[PDB]
Amino acid sequence: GIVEQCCTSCCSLYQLENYCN
């Protein structure tokens, strides 16, 4: 995250752990 951040740029899997339940 941000979802834009991964797409337009680069993001770690760790930043994805932020959108989990």
Of 19, 21, 20, the residue nearest 3 (C-alpha): 19
Task: Please count the other Cβ atoms lying within 10 Å of the Cβ belonging to residue 5.
Answer: 11
- Experimental method reported for this structure: X-ray
Q: For the chain, report the end-to-end CA distance as a whole number of angstroms.
A: 14
Do 5 and 11 form a contact (C-beta atoms < 8 A)? yes
Indicate the resolution in Å. Answer: 2.0
Any idea which residue has 């951040």 for tokens? 5
Q: C-alpha angle with apex 8: 2 to 20, nearest 5 degrees?
A: 25
